[PDB]
From a paper:
Limited (thermolysin) proteolysis of the purified full-length [name] protein resulted in crystals diffracting to ~ 2.3 Å resolution, with SAD phasing using an iodide derivative revealing cleavage of the N-terminal region of the catalytic domain (1–216) and the structure of the TarS217-573 as described. TarS1-349, described above, was isolated by designing a structure-guided truncation mutant (based on the TarS217-573 structure) that resulted in a structure at 2.3 Å resolution with intact [name]-[name] bound in the active site. The intact (rather than hydrolyzed) [name]-[name] in the active site was achieved by soaking crystals in increased concentrations of substrate (50 mM) before freezing. Brief soaking of the TarS1-349 crystals with [name]-[name] resulted in an enzyme-donor complex with [name]-[name] trapped in the active site as evidenced by the ligand mFo-dFc simulated annealing omit electron density. Our analysis of the enzymatic mechanism of [name] was facilitated by the capture of various TarS1-349 structures encapsulating the catalytic domain in complex with metal and substrates. These include the native structure with bound Mn2+ (free enzyme), the [name]-[name] bound structure in the presence and absence of Mn2+ (the binary Michaelis complex), and the [name] bound structure with Mn2+ (product complex). The first loop, designated as the catalytic site (CS) loop, contains the putative base catalyst D178 and moves towards the catalytic center in the presence of the intact [name]-[name] donor substrate. The second loop, designated as the substrate access (SA) loop, is ordered only in the presence of [name]-[name] and sterically occludes an otherwise open channel leading into the active site in the absence of the intact donor. Structural analysis revealed that Mn2+ is coordinated in a hexahedral manner, via a bivalent interaction with both side chain carboxylate oxygens of D93, the [name]-[name]/[name] diphosphates O1A and O1B, as well as two ordered water molecules.
In this article we describe the crystal structure of [name], an enzyme responsible for the glycosylation of wall teichoic acid polymers of the [name] cell wall, a process that has been shown to be specifically responsible for methicillin resistance in MRSA. [name] possesses a catalytic domain with a canonical GTA fold (one of two distinct A/B folds characteristic of nucleotide-sugar dependent glycosyltransferases) consisting of two closely associated α/β/α sandwich Rossmann motifs that abut and form a continuous central β-sheet. [name] possesses a D(91)XDD motif with aspartates coordinating a metal cation, a feature that is typical of the GTA superfamily. Altogether, [name] features a novel architecture with closely-associated trimerization domains connected by a linker region to three protruding catalytic domains that face away from each other.
Residue numbers in the entry: 1 to 349
């Protein structure tokens, strides 16, 4: 067994066939890959739709007692059932290219990848990461490539890599359940590879609610962030490398996560809740890492670590308004003091 395609379902009857047709049309022998379907207690006709593909595909189907509250637990149940050499997570509302398992198998046989990224394509207006999919690369690291800018589970992982290092998704969590999982796989992979010859994984936009839009409390969200920083800092790598990996994670988190602009969008009466959870995550980042981060984020790291929402919000409002209490211009960049009696933050551009 080469691959295990792990499919978590939850009331997926309107789009599960578009998936199952792409596996049935794979030009890969159905005897060397399995479809591990774990249903998160669906109440529509998802399972009988799946049943019609029991002679078109090698299937392993099971259903949970109650809905787990997220994609994590179903994938965890499928992953310990998987006996394929490699694992591919495909969501119920997505589908893969006809040639995916053939090109992957051929690529991994040639380069012995532990994690293999496959190029993605957005369908029906859904955005998709692309900065790391412009060239097929046999070997990429966390620091010479943009792989940290895609933490979704929609990749090829070697089964032994996940099991030998005890890598699973957090359970009862609507979103952010993928970031810690994929980063742990990145942290332990002896070789990470990118495969961009075609458009392999098709991420769709349908209706209704996608899990990436479901509510996750700031406590649960930033606990995952805190766990990622802890995983980075205690990886079996050189200490300077771990600091730089953490800095690159923070650059991306503060630029593109819900943290970016929270004190401008969240209701005032809820922002202490955010600054306390965000601060528990930044308090796990040692202050030495602030120097490796993008300069504009250093005042935010500083006031997050101190749980100071007033100065944090003033920094965000100042960036948005382009107005500062005091600033100097040195070497085409700004050195800013955001409030009276506060420190100056230098090199901001
Ligand atoms: C970035 C990307 O390309 N895909 C991610 C995106 O998918 P997305 O935002 O589309 O969320 P989805 O609804 O597709 O959920 C992902 C998968 O989990 C299953 N599911 C959903 C709810 C539930 O209670 N039990 C269950 O098993 C879905 O059927 C689906 O197969 O946001 C999710 C939340 O982090 C991630 O898991 C997906 O990997
Ligand atoms: Mn989806």
């Amino acid at each position: 067994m080469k691959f295990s395609v792990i499919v978590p379902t939850y009331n997926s009857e309107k789009y599960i066939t578009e998936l199952l047709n792409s596996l049935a049309k794979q030009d890969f022998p159905k005897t060397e890959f399995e479809v591990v379907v774990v249903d998160d207690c669906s109440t529509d006709q998802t399972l009988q739709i799946v049943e019609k593909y029991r002679n078109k595909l090698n299937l392993k189907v099971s259903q949970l007692e109650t809905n787990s509250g997220g994609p994590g637990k179903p994938r965890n149940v499928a992953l310990k059932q998987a006996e394929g050499e490699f694992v591919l997570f495909v969501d119920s509302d997505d589908y893969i290219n006809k040639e995916t398992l053939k090109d992957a198998a051929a690529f991994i046989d040639e380069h012995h990848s532990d994690v293999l990224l496959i190029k993605m394509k957005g369908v029906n207006g859904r955005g998709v990461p692309q900065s790391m999919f412009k060239e097929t690369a046999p070997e990429v690291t966390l620091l010479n490539s943009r792989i940290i800018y895609t933490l979704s589970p929609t990749k090829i992982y070697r089964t032994a890599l996940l099991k030998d290092n005890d890598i699973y998704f957090p359970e009862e969590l609507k979103s952010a359940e993928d970031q810690l999982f994929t980063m742990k796989a990145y942290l332990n992979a002896n070789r990470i590879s990118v495969l961009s010859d075609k458009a392999y994984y098709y991420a769709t936009k349908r209706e209704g609610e996608h899990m990436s839009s479901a509510y996750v409390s700031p406590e649960d969200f930033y606990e995952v962030m805190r766990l990622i920083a802890v995983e980075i800092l205690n990886a079996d790598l050189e200490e300077a490398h771990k600091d730089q990996i953490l800095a690159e994670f923070l650059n991306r988190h503060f630029s593109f996560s819900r943290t970016n602009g929270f004190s401008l969008k969240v209701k005032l009466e809820e922002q202490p809740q955010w600054i306390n959870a965000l601060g528990d995550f930044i308090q796990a980042v040692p202050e030495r890492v602030d120097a490796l981060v993008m300069s504009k984020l250093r005042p935010l790291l500083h006031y997050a670590r101190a749980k100071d929402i007033d100065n944090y919000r003033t920094v965000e409002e100042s960036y948005r308004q382009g107005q500062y209490y005091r600033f100097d211009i040195v070497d085409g960049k700004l050195n800013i003091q955001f409030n009276e009696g506060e420190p100056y933050f230098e090199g901001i551009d």
